[PDB]
Amino acid sequence: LAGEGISVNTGPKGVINDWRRFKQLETEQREEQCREMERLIKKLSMFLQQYRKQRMEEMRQQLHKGPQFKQVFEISSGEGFLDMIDKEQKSIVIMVHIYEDGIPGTEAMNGCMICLAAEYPAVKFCKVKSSVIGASSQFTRNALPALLIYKGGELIGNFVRVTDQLGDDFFAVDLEAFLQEFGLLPEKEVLVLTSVRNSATCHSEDSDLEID
Amino acid sequence: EDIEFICKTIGTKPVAHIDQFTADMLGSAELAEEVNLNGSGKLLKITGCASP
Amino acid sequence: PLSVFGDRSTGETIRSQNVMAAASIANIVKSSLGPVGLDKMLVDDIGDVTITNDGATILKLLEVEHPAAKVLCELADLQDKEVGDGTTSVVIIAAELLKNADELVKQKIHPTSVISGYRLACKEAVRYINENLIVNTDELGRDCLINAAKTSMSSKIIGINGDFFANMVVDAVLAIKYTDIRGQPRYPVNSVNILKAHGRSQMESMLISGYALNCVVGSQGMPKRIVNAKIACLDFSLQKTKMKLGVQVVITDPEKLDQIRQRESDITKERIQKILATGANVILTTGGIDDMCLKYFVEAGAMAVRRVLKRDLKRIAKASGATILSTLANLEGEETFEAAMLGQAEEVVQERICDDELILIKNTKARTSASIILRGANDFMCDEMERSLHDALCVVKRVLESKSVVPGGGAVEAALSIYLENYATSMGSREQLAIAEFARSLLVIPNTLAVNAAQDSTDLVAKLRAFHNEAQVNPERKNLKWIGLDLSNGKPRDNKQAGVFEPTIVKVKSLKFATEAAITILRIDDLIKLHP
Ligand SMILES: Nc1ncnc2c1ncn2[C@@H]1O[C@H](COP(=O)(O)OP(=O)(O)O)[C@@H](O)[C@H]1O
Numbered sequence: 008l009a010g011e012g013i014s015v016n017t018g019p020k021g022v023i024n025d026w027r028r029f030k031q032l033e034t035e036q037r038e039e040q041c042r043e044m045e046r047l048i049k050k051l052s053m054f055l056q057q058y059r060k061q062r063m064e065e066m067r068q069q070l071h072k073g074p075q076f077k078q079v080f081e082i083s084s085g086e087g088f089l090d091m092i093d094k095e096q097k098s099i100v101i102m103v104h105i106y107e108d109g110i111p112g113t114e115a116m117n118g119c120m121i122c123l124a125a126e127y128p129a130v131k132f133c134k135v136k137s138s139v140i141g142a143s144s145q146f147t148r149n150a151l152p153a154l155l156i157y158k159g160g161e162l163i164g165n166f167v168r169v170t171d172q173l174g175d176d177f178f179a180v181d182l183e184a185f186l187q188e189f190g191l192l193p194e195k196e197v198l199v200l201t202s203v204r205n206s207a208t209c210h211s212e213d214s215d216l217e218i219d
Numbered sequence: 220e221d222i223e224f225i226c227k228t229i230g231t232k233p234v235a236h237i238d239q240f241t242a243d244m245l246g247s248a249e250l251a252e253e254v255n256l257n258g259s260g261k262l263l264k265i266t267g268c269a270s271p
Numbered sequence: 272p273l274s275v276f277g278d279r280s281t282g283e284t285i286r287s288q289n290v291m292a293a294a295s296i297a298n299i300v301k302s303s304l305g306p307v308g309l310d311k312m313l314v315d316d317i318g319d320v321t322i323t324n325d326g327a328t329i330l331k332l333l334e335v336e337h338p339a340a341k342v343l344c345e346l347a348d349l350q351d352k353e354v355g356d357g358t359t360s361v362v363i364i365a366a367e368l369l370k371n372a373d374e375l376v377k378q379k380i381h382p383t384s385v386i387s388g389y390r391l392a393c394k395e396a397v398r399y400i401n402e403n404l405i406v407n408t409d410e411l412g413r414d415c416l417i418n419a420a421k422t423s424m425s426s427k428i429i430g431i432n433g434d435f436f437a438n439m440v441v442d443a444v445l446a447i448k449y450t451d452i453r454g455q456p457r458y459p460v461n462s463v464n465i466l467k468a469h470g471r472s473q474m475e476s477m478l479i480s481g482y483a484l485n486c487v488v489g490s491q492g493m494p495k496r497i498v499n500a501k502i503a504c505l506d507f508s509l510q511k512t513k514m515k516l517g518v519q520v521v522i523t524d525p526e527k528l529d530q531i532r533q534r535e536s537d538i539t540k541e542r543i544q545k546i547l548a549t550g551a552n553v554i555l556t557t558g559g560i561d562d563m564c565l566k567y568f569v570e571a572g573a574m575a576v577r578r579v580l581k582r583d584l585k586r587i588a589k590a591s592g593a594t595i596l597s598t599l600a601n602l603e604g605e606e607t608f609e610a611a612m613l614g615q616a617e618e619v620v621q622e623r624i625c626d627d628e629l630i631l632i633k634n635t636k637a638r639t640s641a642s643i644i645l646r647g648a649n650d651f652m653c654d655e656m657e658r659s660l661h662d663a664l665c666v667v668k669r670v671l672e673s674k675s676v677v678p679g680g681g682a683v684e685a686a687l688s689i690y691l692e693n694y695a696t697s698m699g700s701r702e703q704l705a706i707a708e709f710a711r712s713l714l715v716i717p718n719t720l721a722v723n724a725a726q727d728s729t730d731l732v733a734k735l736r737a738f739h740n741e742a743q744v745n746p747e748r749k750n751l752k753w754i755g756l757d758l759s760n761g762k763p764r765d766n767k768q769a770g771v772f773e774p775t776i777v778k779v780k781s782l783k784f785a786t787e788a789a790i791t792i793l794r795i796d797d798l799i800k801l802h803p
């Protein structure tokens with residue numbers, strides 16, 4: 008066996024089409040997969056204090072809004088996750104929840120996220136299935152409840168195993184306080200309810216004048 | 220990047236300090252108006268310039 | 272051979288694909304044309320609901336992939352922006368033009384000849400419309416405006432209540448009338464603040480002889496009604512004066528810290544006292560007002576409104592005669608606030624509108640303004656009323672600016688089709704086919720109107736064409752140019768005497784835009800879609 012120096016030369020430039028056909032799909036694949044590398048593996052491998060104000064906090068958190076209370080957004084596919092995550096700006100804070108049906112703790116914090124999104128309009132609360140996310144099956148056993156927070160492409164929240172840190176019956180107040188004391192939840196602002204709406208648009212600047 | 224084009228078109232000389240801002244460094248123009256493009260946007264035109 | 276990383280379509284395949292995309296876009300909204308058209312309604316992925324009839328809104332809400340379909344969607348958006356009405360008819364006409372042009376091309380007629388024929392047909396159609404089919408509104412009076420508004424609001428959620436909505440629209444438009452240099456009256460629509468609020472029925476919609484703010488007083492202490500309002504408009508916040516970034520406070524003698532802290536708010540106190548000493552009663556600012564300044568206004572028995580929208584404040588200042596103030600600095604280098612810059616109004620109240628409150632500035636002096644409060648059954652209905660109301664306002668503006676109107680119900684389309692079919696024989700050898708196809712494609716509007724009413728489209732269009740042909744061939748029966756379509760009974764009708772009008776600019780602009788879009792799409796005969 009001789010002629011080790013091959014210099015395939017014309018071959019690769021005559022087969023660019025098919026190689027690039029594989030390459031684009033592979034690029035999508037590891038872009039999607041590396042978008043979740045930074046969470047996987049290493050997480051799983053690793054009398055004012057009596058909250059008198061907690062009850063009244065729940066009391067005026069009950070009054071969500073007028074027009075219903077919506078729900079928490081659900082991601083259909085990993086490609087959908089990527090194409091909803093690369094958009095928007097840095098100022099938008101995103102919290103994502105991985106979950107499965109039937110397991111304890113999901114419903115309580117799901118309702119917590121619902122009411123938080125009701126009274127935190129700025130944030131982009133959303134939830135995604137563990138099967139959809141395609142994470143390692145080690146997550147599929149022992150890492151389901153994971154209050155994952157993203158901010159414009161980089162991690163700002165590093166919270167997994169939230170059941171241990173909050174419980175199973177923890178309400179909106181508990182998770183809200185836990186998130187804000189880490190400096191994640193933006194400061195709330197006094198927001199009132201108008202009649203329904205005022206701003207149809209603002210595009211044309213033909214408003215008024217009194218020329219003689 | 221448009222400073223050279225504006226100065227060539229009108230005749231104004233750029234002023235970088237208020238001390239040298241004098242009347243001789245101003246470009247005269249007959250009309251400088253902002254027109255409406257039938258609701259498609261606002262366009263600003265300076266039509267008619269001394270020493271074009 | 273090409274070795275291009277992508278997909279390529281050439282010849283009749285790409286032309287058929289473009290025609291398919293255009294036809295799909297047309298058929299999306301073809302069911303929402305004419306008084307018998309029925310509204311659509313769209314649900315987003317999150318769950319938002321939008322019930323609408325406007326073609327431009329429907330095409331904006333939809334997410335579209337094919338480039339030609341995007342071209343038609345942007346064409347509808349352009350027609351909405353530059354005219355305000357006819358956003359569906361333009362799309363339908365453009366798609367029909369593209370379909371007929373491609374049918375001609377498939378017969379080995381060169382696309383350049385078809386494009387030239389379309390260009391000549393459009394020019395002659397515009398000329399014929401401007402020369403024969405226009406009706407001056409000088410002799411019609413206010414009834415012309417009422418009929419134009421009613422025609423515009425037909426097929427909308429406020430169609431049946433047109434008898435009242437047209438009156439409201441015309442009054443609102445006439446309220447904001449102003450004349451500029453060159454002595455040309457101008458009607459700045461979009462200066463009429465449209466406010467929505469669910470509650471009472473449609474007939475309880477209110478036209479405000481003044482201005483309406485979707486804002487409330489900052490504190491419950493101030494009165495909610497002032498009779499002789501002295502409006503003061505400010506473009507700055509009223510808070511504790513924090514020094515700028517370049518200024519730093521360093522204290523070496525402790526005895527001056529209290530004086531510094533006191534002055535830090537005494538500055539704002541002095542500014543508010545200067546503002547109030549002139550007799551002002553209502554104070555509107557785009558910036559924020561904190562508790563101290565709110566209390567200062569409360570003690571003086573005035574009104575303070577914070578976070579007022581900039582456009583709303585500009586409209587209020589222009590109407591009431593007030594002047595916007597960024598700072599209280601005069602040409603002498605000190606702090607002053609003269610009374611000459613105070614606005615005036617005959618009453619300022621905070622009305623309650625369905626468990627919510629808004630500020631009404633009624634009967635402003637030195638200029639008359641207007642605003643409309645729409646009451647509906649729910650939010651979606653109010654949004655649809657707002658869209659239809661905007662369409663009617665734009666139509667009335669076009670009618671009042673250019674005093675030419677044309678009969679509705681497809682009369683213009685039938686007349687143009689007959690005239691172009693006659694005229695094509697006198698031009699060229701292969702351009703005549705293109706002009707005839709232009710005339711045929713112009714007939715899609717009456718056909719769609721007849722179809723949407725479940726009437727016999729063929730017989731109705733045949734009768735319309737016969738009437739218009741007899742009008743054009745008989746010089747003593749020119750009065751038949753106004754024969755349109757009566758969709759209620761499915762019979763031809765003299766639309767000019769039936770009060771079915773619309774601005775000529777609508778037809779002209781729609782024709783030009785559709786022709787240019789069809790020309791743009793027709794030029795393509797090859798597609799290279801590079802793979803991402
Ligand atoms: N009362 C009526 N009788 C007959 N035709 C009408 C009547 N009102 C409107 N039309 C016609 O129906 C057509 C469709 O208008 P419409 O679809 O409401 O406007 P747009 O195209 O902006 O949605 C118009 O060209 C108009 O001539």
Ligand SMILES: [Mg+2]
Pocket residue numbers: 356357423662
């Ligand atoms: Mg219309």
